[PDB]
Amino acid sequence: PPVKGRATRQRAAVSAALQEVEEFRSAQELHDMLKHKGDAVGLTTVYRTLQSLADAGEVDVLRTAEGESVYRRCSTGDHHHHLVCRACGKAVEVEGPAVEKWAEAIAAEHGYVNVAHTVEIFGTCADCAGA
Amino acid sequence: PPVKGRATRQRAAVSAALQEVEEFRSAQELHDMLKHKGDAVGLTTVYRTLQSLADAGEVDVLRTAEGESVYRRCSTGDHHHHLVCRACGKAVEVEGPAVEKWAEAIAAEHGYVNVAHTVEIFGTCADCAGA
Ligand SMILES: [Zn+2]
Ligand SMILES: [Zn+2]
Ligand SMILES: [Zn+2]
Ligand SMILES: [Zn+2]
Ligand SMILES: [Zn+2]
Ligand SMILES: [Zn+2]
Structure with missing residues (x-):
């Protein structure tokens, strides 16, 4: 998932995390897993990155029953x-x-x-x- | 729209107000409309009664794009x-x-x-x- 701005190790790390897994997950869960594997990346930073990615459409969004948005890097780019x-x-x-x-x-x-x-x-x- | 709870003016008032309106609306909007109509009914009461009605299946729920929830009454009982x-x-x-x-x-x-x-x-x- 290329980003419009200059690539940075935080954006690359969140992209690697997104392509690493296949299930749906929100900003908090991916923040947890990236911090635990040794990324040390911010909550608002990942929130902004996934907002930009969803604007670009590289990832797919889904509002759960409670309401919070979860995101999946889907392999297929078509509808x-x-x-x-x-x-x-x-x-x-x-x-x-x-x-x-x-x-x-x-x-x-x-x-x-x-x-x-x-x-x-x-x-x-x-x-x-x-x- | 019968309510599982005992007959009281709160349930009747909120049910009648919901019946009058035919547009999906949030809890706060319904509370403000009821206040303007002179019901003088609580917001927590609106939430609780609305959740009870949704569990009863007599009303139709919907989730807004930004995250809030709107609710509407449809005459048809079928799916x-x-x-x-x-x-x-x-x-x-x-x-x-x-x-x-x-x-x-x-x-x-x-x-x-x-x-x-x-x-x-x-x-x-x-x-x-x-x-
Ligand atoms: Zn299963
Ligand atoms: Zn997909
Ligand atoms: Zn479609
Ligand atoms: Zn229109
Ligand atoms: Zn309906
Ligand atoms: Zn259907």
């Missing part, structure tokens, strides 16, 4: 949706043109100019049910 | 999704089988035991463009 298990945090890249066509059709029927759909599916793995 | 114009705040309920079929297919393919899909979509309506 896509994520199936997320809260017990595991794993994200599966799922994309469907049917929902996009439905959104376009309902927007056209209602005469709406632009459509910005938020579609999230929350579930549990089969292993989660098993003990 | 439905919402198109909400951020500029005006007006919300309209629709239902399309395609999202349900896609969710079922994804759950079957990935083996997820149970899933909970949230589909709330946003777009500007015609009157926004009109001047």
Whole structure:
């Protein structure tokens, strides 16, 4: 995830942390893990970095049930949706043109100019049910 | 909108005020509107009664983009999704089988035991463009 400004070891470290993992996580959890592995990087610094990255769109954002935003560096850059298990945090890249066509059709029927759909599916793995 | 608690003027007043308005609105906005109407009802009371109603399923919740929560009453008791114009705040309920079929297919393919899909979509309506 290249940054608009000059690259610095803190930005490189947070980028390495983002690409290191695949689950969704907020600023606090990534701050914890980067400090524990030996980065010593600021909370507001990582917050600003992920704000800039989300503005660039290199990462993907998701508001949890409480409300806090979690972020995942997704491999696929095209339009896509994520199936997320809260017990595991794993994200599966799922994309469907049917929902996009439905959104376009309902927007056209209602005469709406632009459509910005938020579609999230929350579930549990089969292993989660098993003990 | 019956409330699980005992009959009291607070619950009746907040339920009637919610019924009068047909727009997604936050707790503070509802509190201010009720104060202006002369209810003289508490804000913590609004929050508690609104959470009780949401748990009862008689009301429809939604999370704002910035983080706050808005709530609205829809006449239909059946499951439905919402198109909400951020500029005006007006919300309209629709239902399309395609999202349900896609969710079922994804759950079957990935083996997820149970899933909970949230589909709330946003777009500007015609009157926004009109001047
Ligand atoms: Zn992705
Ligand atoms: Zn999409
Ligand atoms: Zn799981
Ligand atoms: Zn509704
Ligand atoms: Zn509008
Ligand atoms: Zn649905």
